[PDB]
Ligand binder design. Structure first.
Ligand code: TP2
Ligand code: TP2
Lengths: 264, 264
C-alpha cells in the first residue's frame, strides 16, 4: 500500500545498520506512524499476496485467551510453532494478557470485556486500552510481545484504534499485523454498533532484515492496487463468538506473493 | 516550538468537538507523532514562559519511586496536590511502577535499572521499555497514567526515546511532558556515556480543552524563539542520585507566561 511502500523506502534510505539477537543484520529506524482510514478499504498489502487464513485464526485464538497452540494446530496454522515448548505452550503471551492479565493478589483482568463495556457505556473515555506488556510476566513468555499496546477512540460514530508496535519486521510481520488490527476494529465496531474509523500504526524499532533486501527491492518495483473490502457475513452474539467463515475479503487483486527467509 | 504549534494547529483544524470525563468540552484528534532532535536544543516551549523548576522536582521524585506529595509540597511543587488523598498519597502512580512493578509471584521489577543495564549491555535490544500501564493497579491510582509507556533506542552513539502518551492536554500538560522526558533522556545518556539523540512524542487522545482556546490562539500568534540549552554540572554515580541543582538552562528567552485553568 502507499504508506507501507513509503515506510519500506524510508528504512532503505535512512535506516542504520544494526545487529539483532540472532547475528542477522537489520536496517533500522526508530519512530514511524501511518494512518489507515478503514472506510477507504481493508488495508491488506496488495504489492505481494498476503494470506489472511492464519491471520484470522490467530486473532480468534487471541480473543479466546488460550496460549497453547493446539487450536492453531487443529486448523493447521504454523506461525507460532517454533516458540512453543513440547506441550505446545507459549507462556502468557498475547491472548493470556488480553483476557486474563494476572494480578498480584490472585485475580485476572479481562481487558477485552473492559474495552467492550467502555465502548458501550463511556465511548469518549480516554483510557480504552488493551496492553499485552505485562512487565511481571515477560520472563515467562516464549517471546516479548511485539504488538504491545493499543488504544481505541470514538468520534462521530466511528471507531478508531492505534497500535504501538515496539518491534516491527517491516517485510514479514507488518502486513500481517496491519490486517490483524483492522480486522479487530471491524469486529469491535460491529459489536458496539459503530462505523469503522482509522487504524493508526506507530512503530518503535522498525526494521528490514538483511536477507529481506532482494524481496524488498522486488516489492518496491510494483505499483499498489486499489484495496479490498472486508465483508463480515454474520453478526454473532458477542466479540468472543466469531468463527473463521464469518469473514470474506472481496476485490483482493494482489501481485504475486513474495517468499522471505524467516529469522529465528 | 515549531512542532508544538503545528500540533496545536492540527487539533484546531482537524479535531472533533466532544466532552471530557467531567464534561468540560474538548477538541480532540486521535494519533499524532512528532520529533525533537535534542542536539538542536532542549525542547522547552518558548511561546509562553514555562518553569523548569517543577518539572525537575517531579522527575527526581518519579526516579526515587515516590508517590506521596510530601517532597513536592516541601519544594513548593503543587501540581499533584488536587489528586492526593488526605495523607498526601496518590497510590501506585508513575514512580511506583517505574521502580517496583509488582509481579504475580511477589517480585518487584525495577524498570529504570533494567533499561540502564540494557542500554549499557544490549543497546540494540528492541525491548528497552518502561511501562506505567499496570492494568492490575490502575484503579488503585489517583489517576491513570497519561504518559503511559516509553521506549529507548540507540544508533550511532545517540540515545533516543519514544513516549506513548495515551491522553494529552495539549496546552497545559504537553510542554511539561516534553521537557520532562527530554531531561530523562539527557540523564540516561549521561549515565551510559551516550550523546542525546531524538525525543519522539506520539499521542493517543490529543486534545485542547475548550476553555484553553483563547490562550491557545494567543500562543499561536507568537514566533518560536531559539531553543534553550541544558547544562548538567555533575555526573552522579547512578541515575537515582541526581540533585535539583545539577541542572542549568541557558539561553531561555520566552514570550510571556499565559495562565489557564486546569481540568478536574
Ligand atoms: S517470537 C519473536 C517475534 N515474532 C513473533 O511474534 C511472530 C510469531 C508468529 C506471529 N508473530 S509476527 O511478528 O506477527 C509474524 C507473522 C507472520 C510471519 C511470517 C512472521 C512473523
Ligand atoms: S491526575 C489527572 C491528570 N493530571 C496529571 O496527571 C497532572 C498532575 C501534575 C502532572 N500532570 S500533567 O498532566 O503533566 C500537568 C502538568 C502541569 C500543569 C500546570 C497541569 C497538568
Amino acid at each position: 500500500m502507499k504508506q507501507y511502500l513509503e515506510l519500506m523506502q524510508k528504512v532503505l534510505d535512512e535506516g542504520t545498520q544494526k545487529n539483532d539477537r540472532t547475528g542477522t543484520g537489520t536496517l533500522s529506524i526508530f519512530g514511524h506512524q501511518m494512518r489507515f482510514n478503514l472506510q477507504d478499504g481493508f488495508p491488506l498489502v496488495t504489492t505481494k499476496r498476503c494470506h489472511l487464513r492464519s491471520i484470522i485464526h490467530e486473532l480468534l485464538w487471541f480473543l479466546q485467551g488460550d496460549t497453547n497452540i493446539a487450536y492453531l494446530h487443529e486448523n493447521n496454522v504454523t506461525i507460532w510453532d517454533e516458540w512453543a515448548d513440547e506441550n505446545g505452550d507459549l507462556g502468557p503471551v498475547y491472548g493470556k494478557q488480553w483476557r486474563a492479565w494476572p494480578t498480584p493478589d490472585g485475580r485476572h483482568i479481562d481487558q477485552i470485556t473492559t474495552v467492550l463495556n467502555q465502548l458501550k457505556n463511556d465511548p469518549d473515555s480516554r483510557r480504552i486500552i488493551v496492553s499485552a506488556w505485562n512487565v511481571g510476566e515477560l520472563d515467562k513468555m516464549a517471546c516479548a510481545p511485539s504488538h504491545a499496546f493499543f488504544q481505541f477512540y470514538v468520534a462521530d460514530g466511528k471507531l478508531s484504534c492505534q497500535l504501538y508496535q515496539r518491534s516491527c519486521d517491516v517485510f514479514l510481520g507488518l502486513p500481517f499485523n496491519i490486517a490483524s488490527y483492522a480486522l479487530l476494529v471491524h469486529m469491535m465496531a460491529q459489536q458496539c454498533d459503530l462505523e469503522v474509523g482509522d487504524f493508526v500504526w506507530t512503530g518503535g524499532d522498525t526494521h528490514l532484515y538483511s536477507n529481506h533486501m532482494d524481496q524488498t527491492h522486488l516489492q518496491l518495483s510494483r505499483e499498489p492496487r486499489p484495496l479490498p473490502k472486508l465483508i463480515i457475513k454474520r453478526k454473532p452474539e458477542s466479540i468472543f463468538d466469531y468463527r473463521f467463515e464469518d469473514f470474506e475479503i472481496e476485490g483482493y487483486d494482489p501481485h504475486p506473493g513474495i517468499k522471505a527467509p524467516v529469522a529465528i
